Amino acid sequence: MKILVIQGPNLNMLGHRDPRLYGMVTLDQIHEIMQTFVKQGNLDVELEFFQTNFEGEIIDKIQESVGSDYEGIIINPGAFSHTSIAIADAIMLAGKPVIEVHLTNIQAREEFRKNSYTGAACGGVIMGFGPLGYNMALMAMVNILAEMKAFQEAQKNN
Amino acid sequence: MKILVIQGPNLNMLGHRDPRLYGMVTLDQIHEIMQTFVKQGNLDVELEFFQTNFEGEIIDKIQESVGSDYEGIIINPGAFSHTSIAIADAIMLAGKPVIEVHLTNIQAREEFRKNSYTGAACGGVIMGFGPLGYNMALMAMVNILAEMKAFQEAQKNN
Amino acid sequence: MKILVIQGPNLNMLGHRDPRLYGMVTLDQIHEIMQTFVKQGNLDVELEFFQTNFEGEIIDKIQESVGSDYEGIIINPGAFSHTSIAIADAIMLAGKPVIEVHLTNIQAREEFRKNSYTGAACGGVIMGFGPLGYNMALMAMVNILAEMKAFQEAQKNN
Amino acid sequence: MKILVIQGPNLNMLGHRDPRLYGMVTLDQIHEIMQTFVKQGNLDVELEFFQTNFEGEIIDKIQESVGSDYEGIIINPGAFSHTSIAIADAIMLAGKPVIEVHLTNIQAREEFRKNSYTGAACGGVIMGFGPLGYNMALMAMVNILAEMKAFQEAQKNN
Amino acid sequence: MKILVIQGPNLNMLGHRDPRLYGMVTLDQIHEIMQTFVKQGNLDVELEFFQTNFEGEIIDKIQESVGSDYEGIIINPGAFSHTSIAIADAIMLAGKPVIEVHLTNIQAREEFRKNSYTGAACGGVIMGFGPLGYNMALMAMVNILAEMKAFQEAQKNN
Amino acid sequence: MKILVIQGPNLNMLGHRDPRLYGMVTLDQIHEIMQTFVKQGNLDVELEFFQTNFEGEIIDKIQESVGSDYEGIIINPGAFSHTSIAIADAIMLAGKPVIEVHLTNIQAREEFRKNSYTGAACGGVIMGFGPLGYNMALMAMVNILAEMKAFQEAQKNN
Amino acid sequence: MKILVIQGPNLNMLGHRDPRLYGMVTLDQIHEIMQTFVKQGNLDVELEFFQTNFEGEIIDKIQESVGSDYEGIIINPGAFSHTSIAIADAIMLAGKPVIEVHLTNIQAREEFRKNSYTGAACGGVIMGFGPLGYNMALMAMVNILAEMKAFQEAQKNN
Amino acid sequence: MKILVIQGPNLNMLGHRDPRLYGMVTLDQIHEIMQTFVKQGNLDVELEFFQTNFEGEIIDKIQESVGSDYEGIIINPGAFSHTSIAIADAIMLAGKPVIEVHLTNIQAREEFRKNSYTGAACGGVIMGFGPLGYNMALMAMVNILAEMKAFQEAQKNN
Amino acid sequence: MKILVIQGPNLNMLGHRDPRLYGMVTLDQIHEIMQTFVKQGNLDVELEFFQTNFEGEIIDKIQESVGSDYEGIIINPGAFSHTSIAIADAIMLAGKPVIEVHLTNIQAREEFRKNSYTGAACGGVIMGFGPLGYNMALMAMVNILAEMKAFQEAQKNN
Amino acid sequence: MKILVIQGPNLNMLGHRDPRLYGMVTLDQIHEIMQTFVKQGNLDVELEFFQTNFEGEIIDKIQESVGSDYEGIIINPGAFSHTSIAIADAIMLAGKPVIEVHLTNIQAREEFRKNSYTGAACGGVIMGFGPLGYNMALMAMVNILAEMKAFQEAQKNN
Amino acid sequence: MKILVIQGPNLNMLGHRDPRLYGMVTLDQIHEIMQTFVKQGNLDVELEFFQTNFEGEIIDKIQESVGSDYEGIIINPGAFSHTSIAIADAIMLAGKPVIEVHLTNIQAREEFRKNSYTGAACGGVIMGFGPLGYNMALMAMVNILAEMKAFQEAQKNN
Amino acid sequence: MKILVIQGPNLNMLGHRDPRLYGMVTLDQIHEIMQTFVKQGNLDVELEFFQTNFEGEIIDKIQESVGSDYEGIIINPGAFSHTSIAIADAIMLAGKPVIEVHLTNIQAREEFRKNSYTGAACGGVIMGFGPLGYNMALMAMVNILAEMKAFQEAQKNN
Numbered sequence A, B, C, D, E, F, G, H, I, J, K, L: 001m002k003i004l005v006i007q008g009p010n011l012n013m014l015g016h017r018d019p020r021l022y023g024m025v026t027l028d029q030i031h032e033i034m035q036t037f038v039k040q041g042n043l044d045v046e047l048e049f050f051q052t053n054f055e056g057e058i059i060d061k062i063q064e065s066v067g068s069d070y071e072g073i074i075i076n077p078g079a080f081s082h083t084s085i086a087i088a089d090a091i092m093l094a095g096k097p098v099i100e101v102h103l104t105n106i107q108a109r110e111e112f113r114k115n116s117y118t119g120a121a122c123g124g125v126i127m128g129f130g131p132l133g134y135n136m137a138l139m140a141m142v143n144i145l146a147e148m149k150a151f152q153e154a155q156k157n158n
């Protein structure tokens, strides 16, 4: 079971700068916490990670997931959440669970950060738990895929 | 470790009405899924549940948590999320983690449901995963309390 | 055929309010006018009246209507019509006709009195006719149950 | 006692419109339902019906009512309710009761259908009850003229 | 196959006034170029033209289209595009392909001209090509009507 | 020298209704005050008067003035001032002075009466002087035409 | 001479929480300082205190004031100031001097706190003086009530 | 009969700069056209002129008119029309006719020039006729004072 | 202990004009009642009064307060409250307690009067009590200044 | 005569996803139908196609058009239409006819899709005709280019 | 070459304001820094400095610059930048370069500080660089007069 | 001392744009003017220039500046200044001075060009001075590093 993890603009500078909102954890540190979680829980999940500062690369990458080795996407589109109708459109044609994660509680920051075009297109949104939000998304994803598969074959047979 | 779970207006009619947004699960059914989760994971957590259609009762109940047997609140304030500055004020003086949960993705519904006063006051917000969102909150809460306690005594000593 | 009449906040001080908008009639007097209209019309109709200044009690009541001795609701939510998303949701999940009544023409007052959340949920809205408006609501409620009940017997036989 | 019924634009295509909102009734059929309601009620009431798609003709008519064979007006200005300040002014200078009727619940449709200029000018507004709403308007119109006429004889004798 | 061409207010003053936006061509010259197009392309299409400065007349003529010698409508509702909820309703009830044409790019003009209520009701909108836009409409309408016909016989004989 | 005077909707009911904004003067009374003014001042001006409740008739009438017996228009578009882009467009292609008059000070009434589309298209606007505003417009018009004619021939010669 | 002091939601948590805005004083200490003021100034004034987190309770208690042992009300409706059209209505129907008090300067806080519906219904508003504001209210109320009394006997014996 | 003429900021630079909106006429030139008008029409009117760039001086000057040698004010508050609540308040306590004049049609310029606080306080508003607007105001003023005086003594006697 | 009382534009016209909002008392009478209060209460307080219709003068006089014979300011900036960012800045840089007073309840007036920029800069705001509000300000200022003094000697000798 | 066809983000996923709005046709099939049109109509037109999900790439390719093998551009900037001031600038500096095409009627969709910054920069806009719109663009472009050529030789030899 | 430096309200209290935004520099000190920059640069440049808290004095000064010993203006209108249409008009009719300077980054402060009316009138705006910004303005002012003066001699010879 | 100059989209077409706003200068030419200004000033300053039409590349570059051979950044983000929250975040985490430059006065253009997200993040903004603005940015950048570097040696010695 392949899960894609897409990290948006500036998230590679995470850990390195502004401990007030974000703390002292790098992006690589978040990705290995996600590994431990999977190996520890003994889950049959294989993670691929991708980070870009480019709106187009995010869209390209969501489009590749259609040719489905991947079964789900966990995405933090970063500042593009508030501006990108394109990425929201990409998500709406994925035909697979997409969960949005934000490190910070965007309902408590500047006014231009409150709307998430992208979030409205995703099935679910997690915000404000820092790195933890990411494992919450893995948990969520695994239940959803597990749920879909149980439904599918058990409904298909009869 | 005592966690309070507060369920807002109309959430007692859940399961009984409109399978399109909400599906076929009662409020009692959500509360027992939260029990299994705790007993299964072998967590030292004791849940108390409370549901009311009254803005004042929610505020009263948050105020009781100050006299702390309770260490955290998981709250779905329902339609009061969008209107209640009072409940948001209550949350801001709790002096303990408060996580907000919504069954539905409020970024994808009517315009008057997009802002959460209450959500802005909570440390974190989970939306759109249905009943599952609630266990995600338990997971989150347990890590946060575990984290705070590790920090506290290990920083206190030195 | 039992019909619930809910009256919202401050309606009990009716007969003592601004004499221009409201006149000099009492809430007790309106409920007589409705009985008289039932008597004189030979409408097999049992009316129950309930007035509160509490949002939550209105929600409680609407919810108790689902234990369905009652077949319709006539509601004047008062000032809560403009603020209560909670009551609007309850109306939406009553599964039975709800008619909103206002004494005054709310399109003709202050700006914040123009939107009715509750009214968007009801099947219909009546405003501007003072006390008489309740009798119009009765007239319609009787007529909608009669039409619904001819329609339920017209599709169980075929 | 003569009562004018004005019907606004597109109401003549009724019975051929969106079958959800409007059903399959005709404007001719509504006007029968109103006659039948007058007959069966023994209301000494002479109804005249007039439908136009022209703003100016509605204004013309309302104005001709001032040469007062007519004592009341029942109007459904249609789409012009949201745009016509002209018709609203005419209503304001008719010097006789005007009741606005809508078939559909206009609080429950598009944003631009929510304001009624014309409705703010009328004594009262009825929306959401389909054809039945016209009979409610009649009921009220009869009742307002009766009350006005008891009041005109109660202050010329003293 | 009759196509009704409705032209809105002030379009009769065309050609004679303001060369900067509108150029040197009269409304009658536009109706010639359209006939020329049909004649040259050899299409079995009869055009009928109509210009008015009256809102209710436009609605009237749309309403006449339903009694159908007319298979479609090309309309330039002029300034009414931005104000007329009523014409927009008429188009919706027509139940035939309607195309909206504008000589100028209404996206590049005053702010009150960007909104087309009528446009939102039409199947398609063409703007900013001067008189050419009118022929583009014809092309499209002939193509739309061809498909419908092909589709009509091929979907009954399955 | 021919001046056209166009009076908009409801202005024929003037004098007859609401002495608070408008006083006790009929439309015919205003038109004869305009006559006295011209004959008294010994002006070579001939007035034609026109009143309609129809947006289209106003536009038709402005369009006739192009075929110029008329040299100027004095217009009170009434409630159409605030809604009619069409009439404003008509005015902009007249190619002759158009002065707008309002009996009332529209900067002091309801909010929806503050903007005048039409006023923005006219060279000048007079408001709030009651019937007097009309002679002020005649004065203005006469100076403007007198000024234009002086300029024209005196500049043409050299 | 009884003055009813109504305190709104979360004011019972006062003194115990957030020193930056609110300082070190409990609600009970505020009620002492008020009694002290009355006692020292020697005024024939009996205070009665009441705190609630329930909207309908505030309305109830205002409604109880009409049956009048109570000559006036000092109210701090808390967060409800900004949301409660209903409390604002209650104050309007009370027919007695009501003063609104706020500990903090609501003009200098979040944007959603600048609007007081309740304040607009009160005779006067005091804000930003901490507990002192409460005594300022007493001063004013005693003065307002003194005038009324003087005025009451002096305007009947003319 | 003394009329005060107040000219607002930048109106002293008139004539000297930007012939496109304003033409080639100085402020002194406007004031002498107003003189000719009075002496020519043989009117018993004596004009005083005042120009300032100071909001306070305008207010001081309106306040002096109360001590009434003056019977009316003609005012062009310039850019202060759009910003000054103070000057509007001054005008509302003058207790004498105040007419507002603008050289330019402020309904046709930038958006921030459309509202006139001051204009809403004046009895009347004249805009867009250039210097001419000023004599139109003199005409208006003279009729108004003449009218008031005729009414006063003729109503006083009987 | 000098308290500077600054009064804004048009307050000098007080008492003489508009009895409905403002009543029968002159600005000089208000300054008497203030002196009387100080004299009777026996307080070691010297008042200095100042009224102006000029914005820059208010700023000047605030700026003079910094060179400090003056321990505080009571201000009613009048209409400038709603417009003057500059006065608001002056108050912020003053570094002394400033209280804002308004005779009327600016929450209950026109919409453009609800915003106080100056108020948001002051420590506290009093509104709607007529001349009384002025004494309330004195009380508060004397109390605020007493605390500061007590605090000043007690926080250096720890 | 080369025409550059630029297609925006997610248009490559066309045909494969969401039949309700977009239908059953791939982007490559659209490029065929365009070639077919050119081939059949016999036009001396060479098409070059380009699709990208990257904003800067669209700008790059427009910028390449200036070095001109290319006489014109047909563009569907996709979701970027509503957000990209930058693409809109590129189009403005191109100095060649650009037509904007949209498959769907963007006037009839979500509110954030009604605004086209790019559209306002193009000569003309076509929307709501599915793939057909693309050929309509070709027709128009060939006609626009024909005129320009004719005009170009005829305006130098005068 | 004489250059006027106008400084707006509260700039004289500089060196005593909020030490974060402004530091601890004085207006006297800034004017030295500008002299020093003129001296050390050998710019034949005579500087005059003027500071006021009065809108009208700024207008007076700008106007006196038209009696042109001065060739350029460097202005920091202060808080009036956001409110003064008057000053913006004066700048527009100075007929000479005007550069606006701000100490603080006004895009980075409160919402009401973001618009600069005055800045839209100036040739250029400088913000955010504290005192240094004045020397940048000088640099540019010198460079613009040099370029203008090469351009005035390059078109009087040809 | 190395200084990065980033240039945003379309700046490369400079010298070919609208000749009014931009003139006829090239991006190559601006970069010479900056070198020349470094040479002639003896500023030990190494400039690197980079222009892109891609949002992501700007983010990439700003990020690479953190591997700090570069000490300051001078950026003209172009159209992205009004839309890019991403670039604004990158600026915020560069940890070194960033100055925003615009050629044109963006307060003086279209409404959507007025806000600069990017500019709110920079230490300072320069607009309106065309090419010269870059040399002003250099001047300031040099001066800010000199001041920072005197300040870093003034607090490591103490």
Ligand SMILES: COc1ccc(C[C@H]2C(=O)[C@@H](O)[C@H](O)C[C@]2(O)C(=O)O)cc1
Pocket: A009, A010, A011, A013, A014, A015, A017, A018, A022, A076, A077, A078, A079, A080, A081, A101, A102, A103, A104, A105, A106, A113, L085, L089, L093
């Ligand atoms: C320190 O550099 C950072 C850059 C981005 C973020 C992520 C956040 C972000 O980029 C915001 O623009 C967005 O609105 C929320 C965010 O995506 C998050 O909190 O996860 C965190 C740290």
Ligand SMILES: COc1ccc(C[C@H]2C(=O)[C@@H](O)[C@H](O)C[C@]2(O)C(=O)O)cc1
Pocket: B009, B010, B011, B013, B014, B015, B017, B018, B022, B076, B077, B078, B079, B080, B081, B101, B102, B103, B104, B105, B106, B113, C085, C089, C093
């Ligand atoms: C079927 O009755 C229900 C009533 C409330 C809810 C919860 C949701 C709700 O009450 C909305 O008003 C709110 O904006 C979101 C909600 O709290 C949620 O999705 O959890 C679900 C089902």
Ligand SMILES: COc1ccc(C[C@H]2C(=O)[C@@H](O)[C@H](O)C[C@]2(O)C(=O)O)cc1
Pocket: E009, E010, E011, E013, E014, E015, E016, E017, E018, E022, E076, E077, E078, E079, E080, E081, E101, E102, E103, E104, E105, E106, E113, F085, F089, F093
């Ligand atoms: C020169 O007389 C004319 C009057 C109207 C029009 C048409 C345009 C119009 O009436 C506007 O109100 C509308 O927004 C766009 C218009 O319909 C068009 O461009 O076709 C063209 C020329």
Ligand SMILES: COc1ccc(C[C@H]2C(=O)[C@@H](O)[C@H](O)C[C@]2(O)C(=O)O)cc1
Pocket: D085, D089, D093, F009, F010, F011, F013, F014, F015, F017, F018, F022, F076, F077, F078, F079, F080, F081, F101, F102, F103, F104, F105, F106, F113
């Ligand atoms: C009593 O019937 C009247 C109807 C219209 C009017 C004219 C005014 C009007 O129609 C308003 O809708 C418009 O905004 C201003 C008006 O045109 C005017 O004051 O002249 C006056 C009296």
Ligand SMILES: COc1ccc(C[C@H]2C(=O)[C@@H](O)[C@H](O)C[C@]2(O)C(=O)O)cc1
Pocket: H009, H010, H011, H013, H014, H015, H017, H018, H022, H076, H077, H078, H079, H080, H081, H101, H102, H103, H104, H105, H106, H113, K085, K089, K093
């Ligand atoms: C060339 O200097 C002038 C300055 C002001 C004015 C008057 C106009 C003005 O000051 C605007 O700010 C105002 O909105 C309208 C104005 O008062 C008018 O057109 O009379 C005319 C010319």
Ligand SMILES: COc1ccc(C[C@H]2C(=O)[C@@H](O)[C@H](O)C[C@]2(O)C(=O)O)cc1
Pocket: H085, H089, H093, I009, I010, I011, I013, I014, I015, I016, I017, I018, I022, I076, I077, I078, I079, I080, I081, I101, I102, I103, I104, I105, I106, I113
């Ligand atoms: C009758 O002359 C008066 C002029 C001004 C005022 C004061 C009020 C005022 O100037 C308004 O612009 C302001 O919004 C409120 C006011 O300052 C107050 O109520 O104190 C009172 C009376």
